[PDB]
Amino acid sequence: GSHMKMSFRWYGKKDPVTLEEIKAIPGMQGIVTAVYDVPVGQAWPLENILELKKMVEEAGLEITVIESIPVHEDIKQGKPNRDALIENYKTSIRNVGAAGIPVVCYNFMPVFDWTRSDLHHPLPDGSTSLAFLKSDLAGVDPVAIIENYRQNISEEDLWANLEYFIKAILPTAEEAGVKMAIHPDDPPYGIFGLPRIITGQEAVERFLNLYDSEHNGITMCVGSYASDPKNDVLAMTEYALKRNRINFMHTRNVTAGAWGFQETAHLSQAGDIDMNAVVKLLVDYDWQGSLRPDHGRRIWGDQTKTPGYGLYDRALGATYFNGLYEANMRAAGKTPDFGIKAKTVGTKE
Template structure:
C-alpha cells in the first residue's frame, strides 16, 4: 500500500446525466453514455488510472447536521435517522448534492423516481456497466463504484450499492478487474448490519478493489444514526488496523485516501472535508502500515 504506483490521481465523477438519464433508463441515455465513453478515452490518454463514481439516485451523501460538535470539541458531519426522517428533500440544499437543479427540476425528478424501484435501478446500472466497460478496458481506466452513503434507502428513493450481497451482485454484472469497487469503509459501516472489514477482505480476494476510502465513523446506537469521527480505531466503530492489515496482506497497490475530515484547530471550510484532519488521517494510515509491515517480518 505504501508503494502505490499510479500515473496520476484517481478521478471522481458522479455526472448529472447519470442521475437524470441512466439511473432512470431514459431513451436518450445512449447519447450520454457515448459522451461518457469518450471521457474515459480522454482520461486514459491523460494517464488517469481510476474513476470513482456512484449510482445514487438524485442525492449523493446525506447528513442531518453538517457542523455537529463532538465530545472532543471538533465539528463533524452526523446522520441522525430520526431527524432525516422528518426532512422534506424537495426543500433541502446540502453540500455534496447536485446544486444545478432548480426546485422545479428537483420536484420533477423526485416524481419520475416513483416509477423506479430497486430492481429497475439494478437493470439500469447493468445497462450502463455493460455499455462502458469495453471502453474502460481499452482505455486502461479502472472503474470503482462508490457505495451509497448512507447505504440504505432515504426519502423513499432506492439505493442498491449497500452491502456485501450487493457488491457481489455488482461485480458479477461484468467479469473484469476494470469493473471494480471503491471500498469506503466509513460508508459501509454506517449501516450496523454491515461488516465493512469483512467486505473489504472479500473484494480484495476477488481483485475488485480499485480504490479505498479509509475513514472511521462512530455508530451512536440510535438505530442507523452515526457520527463521522477521527480516523483512529478507538474514536469510531471500525478497526482501522484491520483495514490496513488486509490491504497489506493482499499486497494492495491501488489508490487509498483518508477521506473526509472533522473541522479541528479552528479551521472552517467545506463541511466534511477538513484539511488538517485528513492530513492527520493520512499520517495515521502510514503509521499503521509501518506497524503492520514490521509485525509481518
C-alpha cells in the same frame, strides 16, 4: 506485491487547500481530483484533464484517481436518451486513459450524492463533524425526478438501469486501460423514497458480477458501508480483496448503531471501524492502489467550508495510515514504500 500510494482530494484551482500544502503531508503521493468546468453528462476534453495534471505534477505529485466522472441522472433514471449521455461517459473514460490516470471513481446514487442532517455536530472533545440523525428532520420531502423514482423505478429497475450502464462503458474502460471503481451509496440505504442498491456485501457481489473484470471494481469506502451496522466492512473488504476488485480505498471512520450515524476522527478507537484490521488486510493481500483519508472533523480554526474536506484532520488521517501501513508492512517481512526519493536537498555525505 503490495503498493499503496497515499492520496489526498483536491478540487483544483479554486481549492481552499493548496498543492504546496498537500505535498507537505509526509508520504503523500496521489492527488484525487476531477474536471469541474464541464456540466454533468457532458464529456470531459483532454485539455481540461491535462491542465489539472500539469498543475499536480509540477507540485511534485500525480493524479492517481479521477474522483468522479459524474453519472447524469437521466442515465441513472433509465431514460431513453441515456445512450447519448453514455457515449459522453465513454469519451471522458477514453480521455482519462489518455492522461495516464489509472482509475475512475463514480456513484450510481439517485438525485443525492450523500445525506447529512447536521454539518457541525459536536464531538466529545470540541471538534465539530457531520452526522446522520435518524431522528432529526427525517421523514420529510426535500424542499420531477424524485417523484419519477418514488413512483415508478424500483431497486431492481435500478439494478437493470445500472447493468445497462456498466455494460456500455466497460469495454471502453478496458481499452483505455482505466479501472472503474463504484462508490457505495451514502448512507448505504433507502431514504426519501429514493432507492439505493450499492449497499452491502450481497450487492458488491451482484455488482462485480455485472461484468466480471478488474476494470469493473469497487471503491471500498469503509465509512459508508459501515454507516449501517447491518454491515461488516472487514469481511466486506476481505471478500472484495479475495476477489481482486478493490480499485480505490477511502478510509474515514464512523460511529453507528440503531440510532443513526456520526463521523469521527480516523483512529480506530474514535468510531466503530478497526482501521488497523482494514490496512493489515490491505497488507496481507499485497493490495496495489490508492487510499485517501477522506472526510475530517473541524479541528483548529479550520476555515475550509466544503464539508469534510478541511485539510487538517484529513492530513492527521494520512499520517495515521502512515503508521498503520508501515507497522503492518514491517510485521509481515514486507518493506514499506512511501515514495520518498530524497531526505535532503544540497547537503549529503
